Design a protein around this ligand. Sequence first.
Ligand code: NA
Ligand code: NA
Ligand SMILES: [Zn+2]
Ligand SMILES: [Zn+2]
Lengths: 280, 280, 280, 280, 280, 280, 5, 5, 5, 5, 5, 5
Amino acid sequence: SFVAAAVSRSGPAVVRIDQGSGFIIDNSGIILTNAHVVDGASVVVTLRDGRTFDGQVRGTDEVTDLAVVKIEPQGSALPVAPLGTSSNLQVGDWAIAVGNPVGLDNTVTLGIISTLGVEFIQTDAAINPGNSGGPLLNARGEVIGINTAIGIGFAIPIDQAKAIQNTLAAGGTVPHPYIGVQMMNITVDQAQQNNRNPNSPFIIPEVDGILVMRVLPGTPAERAGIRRGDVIVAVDGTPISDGARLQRIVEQAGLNKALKLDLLRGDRRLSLTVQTAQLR
Amino acid sequence: SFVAAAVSRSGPAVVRIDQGSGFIIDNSGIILTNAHVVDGASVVVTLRDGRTFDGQVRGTDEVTDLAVVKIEPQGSALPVAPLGTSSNLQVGDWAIAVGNPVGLDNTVTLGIISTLGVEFIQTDAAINPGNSGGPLLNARGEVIGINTAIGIGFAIPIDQAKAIQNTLAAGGTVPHPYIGVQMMNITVDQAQQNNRNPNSPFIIPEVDGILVMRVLPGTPAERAGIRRGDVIVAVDGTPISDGARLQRIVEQAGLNKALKLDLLRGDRRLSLTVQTAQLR
Amino acid sequence: SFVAAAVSRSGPAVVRIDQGSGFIIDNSGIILTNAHVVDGASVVVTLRDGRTFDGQVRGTDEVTDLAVVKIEPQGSALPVAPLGTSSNLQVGDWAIAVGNPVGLDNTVTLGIISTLGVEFIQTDAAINPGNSGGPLLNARGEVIGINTAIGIGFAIPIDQAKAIQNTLAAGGTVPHPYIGVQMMNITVDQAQQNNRNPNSPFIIPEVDGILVMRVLPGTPAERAGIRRGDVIVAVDGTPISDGARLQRIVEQAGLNKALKLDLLRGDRRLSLTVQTAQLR
Amino acid sequence: SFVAAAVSRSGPAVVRIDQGSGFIIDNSGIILTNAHVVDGASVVVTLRDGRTFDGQVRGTDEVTDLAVVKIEPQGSALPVAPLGTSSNLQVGDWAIAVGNPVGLDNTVTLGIISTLGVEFIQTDAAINPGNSGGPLLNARGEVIGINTAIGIGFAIPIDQAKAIQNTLAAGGTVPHPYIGVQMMNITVDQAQQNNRNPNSPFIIPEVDGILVMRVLPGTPAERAGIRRGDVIVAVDGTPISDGARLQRIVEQAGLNKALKLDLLRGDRRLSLTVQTAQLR
Amino acid sequence: SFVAAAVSRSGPAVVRIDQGSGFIIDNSGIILTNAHVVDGASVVVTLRDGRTFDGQVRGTDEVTDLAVVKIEPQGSALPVAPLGTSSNLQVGDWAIAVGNPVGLDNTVTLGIISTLGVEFIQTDAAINPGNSGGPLLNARGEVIGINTAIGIGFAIPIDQAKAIQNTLAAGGTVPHPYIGVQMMNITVDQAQQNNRNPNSPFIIPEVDGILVMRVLPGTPAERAGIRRGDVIVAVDGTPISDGARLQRIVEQAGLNKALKLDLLRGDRRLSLTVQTAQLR
Amino acid sequence: SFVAAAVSRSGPAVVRIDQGSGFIIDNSGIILTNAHVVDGASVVVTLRDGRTFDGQVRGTDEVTDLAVVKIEPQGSALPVAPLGTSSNLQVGDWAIAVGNPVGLDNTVTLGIISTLGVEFIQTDAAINPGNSGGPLLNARGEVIGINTAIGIGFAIPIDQAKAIQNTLAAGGTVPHPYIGVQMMNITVDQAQQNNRNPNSPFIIPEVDGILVMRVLPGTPAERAGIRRGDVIVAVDGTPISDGARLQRIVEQAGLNKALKLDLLRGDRRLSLTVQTAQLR
Amino acid sequence: XXXXW
Amino acid sequence: XXXXW
Amino acid sequence: XXXXW
Amino acid sequence: XXXXW
Amino acid sequence: XXXXW
Amino acid sequence: XXXXW
Ligand code: NA
Ligand code: NA
Ligand SMILES: [Zn+2]
Ligand SMILES: [Zn+2]
């Protein structure tokens, strides 16, 4: 079977972490896994061959859910999993999820790339606590993702983990700018439609947009005076009605980057500047 | 025991209905019970002595939850329960709940008047499906209420059932004027307090009052344009802030009685006239 | 309080058994309790004063749910509860339920006789595992029942326990004749009414009677060929339609007493003789 | 991967419906889906490319669970999924389930034909609300079924949907003749075996056959006098003992086609004619 | 009814607290209630007559579950509940539980003293969140307890609340010495009986005594080296085998009172001194 | 599809058993299945072609969960499934699970060998009650396992069933030596770590090893005096600390083979000889 | 009806 | 507040 | 047996 | 709409 | 036995 | 550790 080759290629580099899995990224002893495998730790690593090194967690991104562990190479060469690239993934490509749940073998499951979010990988390969943090391979045996348990599983794209590799190897805080608002895409035909239901919470000022559904406690949005039911219309002068889209321009703005917000509170015209803080 | 006397006095007039209980109000065969005992029916009555008459339901008030059944007197005199009065009930008076769950005896439970709503009687006498529709007696054995199952039970005050006795004996529709709004007593210190929570549904225009919490479907309130979040301030020119109090002036107004309503919708000044319909 | 007297009279004779309660019937050390307190045992008894005798169970009736324990009198006189009579119980009489849950006091609860089955006593006195097997007293403090936990409690009438006292003191098997059939009272207007429902199990041969609802495994009824759906009409020549009534004539017949049964199986005419066995 | 080709072939024709999926059958704008996706509607369609047409449901078969939607072709050519044939399906063939859950991509899952009912397709391809109404493809990318969510999924065979395509395109009522009886295959060795259990509902007249287990309300079977427990032996003179088989001859008979039924009710010989109505 | 008098005597002094009840102890505005009514607060008090004072919590004992609130007397005299004494309570005495759940009436329930722990009062008077913190009266209407919700309710004896009244009026910390060990009374015939079960946790060194079942985190017992399974035999030279009894001598010792403990850990002879800390 | 070949090769030999599946091992009528399919039986077999033979269970191993059924060859040749070998299984090989849930077709599911215990096979092929007892095939269609239902399924390796084939064909009792102890691998750094938790059941005598966690009722271990909390150190003189390893040497010893055990009970030095009995 | 037995 | 209606 | 209908 | 944050 | 503490 | 037996 073609999967046997793939597994023979990256499988020896898939380790147990202590629960969860991980894979060795290079001969130095740089190991990738899920942040939720590293209950904050500061761990223990078992290779497929039985060797037990003592790893320490040199970085963690809770929001991307991936961590970097470090072990010290001694004796035999640390086996290494080849990194592929997730940019050229095609829906329908073979996907192989490898774990090391006990620390002496690989549990291997097979499926395809079910959907592509670049953003997130779904696959119908059985993804479970036994292979979480472990790698997801293509048919050639190069890792294109990191399994993440929560019939369709998820995996963090590999190119995503490449980006924050050094940062988590060194000082582990990745820039995740945010303002703290739960928004929802509103349509006029949902708005004035809402406005005709006598028991709707608030009347939406017609229009299309991002209806602020909730202001989260202790967030820049709260501190800027933003209220539930507000309708943000123009950031600085860019018309928006997509929640996905606003989740971006905040990121393209730095941390501690003051952003003005044009919004209307029922009838009133409101402009406030929020300062992007770090998601934590 | 003093309760044995009481039970010997009204107990023979307590019947089974078919589930639930009832009591015979006079020798004509006028029987009181709960509306929820008469699943709409149109029934069968068993006396304590085993006699089975065939009753028909000549009236029902679903909202007061009491019904009038009629049976045809034949042979021996229908035993009759003496009616007392609930106006002079004192908290702490003995209360005896009598039922006829099988149709050949009385189940009897004993307690006190726990609280007085005139409006509703609570008692720590065991009130259960076996004695529901049955009478609640004072220490002398005169009925002061009608048990209503749903450790404290409820009973409909007897003077209340006296009022609508003839109406339910004849044509069974009792005037229950209403407008269809679920209101809540709001305080300034709850209002501007609400207004400082960023995630509250709507901003209350400060003040004290009746915050319209919900407009029920197909009600006069809906038809008058009343919306959730509206704050009714003055009916015609009578300042109100009590939900209990407004539940009254509507009643003192007839059925189909147009009532103007001064309310403010956030900032706007709103006057609407609702026409009281029949609760059903 | 009048109950304080009653409790002072029989309370010292109420013991803990080991869970459950019991009471001492005479100075010999004859103790009454529930059969379900004596998980078959063969026990330990604690008096209100702290004295711990060692009791043995000299009898058990599982179907009446009462047992006789025996302890050996030594030192101080065993306190003794006066036995009243349940024959003259009036609905509404005061009832006091006494237990000894720890073995150093009495838990006492108060209520009335809620209903009278002679057959079974119901009361609104709190009856719970703490006072089960314990006595139920009248206002004078003589026992009129034995509490039985399973808001209304049950108690075994005392005159009932008097009857089988010696038998359970000596060789513990009480004559409980039976045949093993679950019957139901059927009415023509339930029968031909059943017969017009196309999805009813079997057509009942019209008539009124005892519809055999279930034949229990390994019973005389099974061995006599009795089937579910049979309709017993005349025992030997006595028309019956009451399940309660048939539960009697079997008892008035001895154990191993052959009883013929006239029944019809749909259309066919069936006469079978069942031999009454002992309920166990 | 071979599935990438298949998906590239039919995937662009897989649309979102509004929840559920569908696929475009030709350039006219004829769309297939599940009847349970069309909560009766009368909808909105989103293509993979983001184009949102406005569809209307021109037909529905609730019992086959498939619907035909129609959209109006404008601008770019509506992509079209090639229809294969389900007649030549082999157990073990590759099966690809495609959905369009958001309206901008395909979620794709892979498996095999697990079993073949022609009648119904099972597959171990992940079938879920995200791909329901969507197509099931063979390895070449031609649709051989319609996914139906409810680890094994179901799909409506494509040749089945071809048959009722025009009918649901035009006036949407497909002939589903029926009589309304829940039958069960009975065996002598189950029959006289049943007859020896004393607590079985009814005695089966020995034989092998279709034991009428239930007569459903308001059905031809009810109107013909058919009762639970009846045993249908010969339709007009064709011996039957298979529930699957009788589910056929009724279909080969028209709607409103009178069918005589030879059955025995315990001992009696019964012949009744039921008139086949439309399942609804 | 005699209860009407009692209620007329203490009922006007029963207030609502804001959920829970309380009663006014003197004209100064000293109010008793449950500590669990005062979710730590620092409150609002409504009298039966509708007067709303503003109370503050000047003391709390979480372990006795009672609190002292203070309000400022103005206008009409604060009604006052007469304090009785719980020392002379007899099992079977009438008990009346009064609450003020809304702030304009009394809910009153009636029962008896079910059992006496001085330590704790049980009663079959309905005790619920509506009357918790409220008083429990004798037949004359003097308070003998404080209702405490969690069919039998509990009440804190009044003489108990008298003792810590001033302390909670002033600086609110009551001496509750403890060591932090969960003990269990062990018997030789339970010990060597335990020792013959092959799957019992630890072998008990025979004997009778207090088997340390659990050492609670951060307690004097933990700090003294006490382990689960230890058997304390002699405090300083007083043989003990009762858990209730040891719960005393610690109290008769002060706070920060070093107590030596003779115990054996399996075979070894162990003497440790624990220093009594404050339960919190 | 390659699986179609495989299924065409072994699929006709896959039968229904009566619930569960099985496969025919040779033309004699030797059938393999799960022991849990044969609820003890002593059965009925349906071939894919509809032929119903009458099988009897000539052997059962409850602990390996496989059974041998026998049917009598008549008429057409019994189709036969080719046996492969599980010794050379590679993780990632294709695995095809075949069942015959109704008795007229094959339900077929596809996946890979997920992990290899020789000891147990896991696969991501859908394994369910419909294919349990059925065979698991490689890509060529030779059976390498027996499906066992309980997303990853299990299968009994085929070479394992080959070993006990004759034994279960003849007299059905397979040697399963055991002693009856639930052990756990203990580490010093878990031991003295356990010993520093004040609430741990027993103090472990430091060391590494097999901590006896439980002695099961009526086992050789119980009869040898082994207690919970004992630490077995050397069998006869072989240091052990692995639960998996001890589960072996007992097997390499016969049935009724006396094995000495060096263990320490806290401080004491204990040597006991257990006699291996048969697991049942 | 009752039954029992 | 109450409501009802 | 099946049924349906 | 999404939200998050 | 009781415990508490 | 495992156990079993
Ligand atoms: Na009472
Ligand atoms: Na696959
Ligand atoms: Zn799969
Ligand atoms: Zn009560």
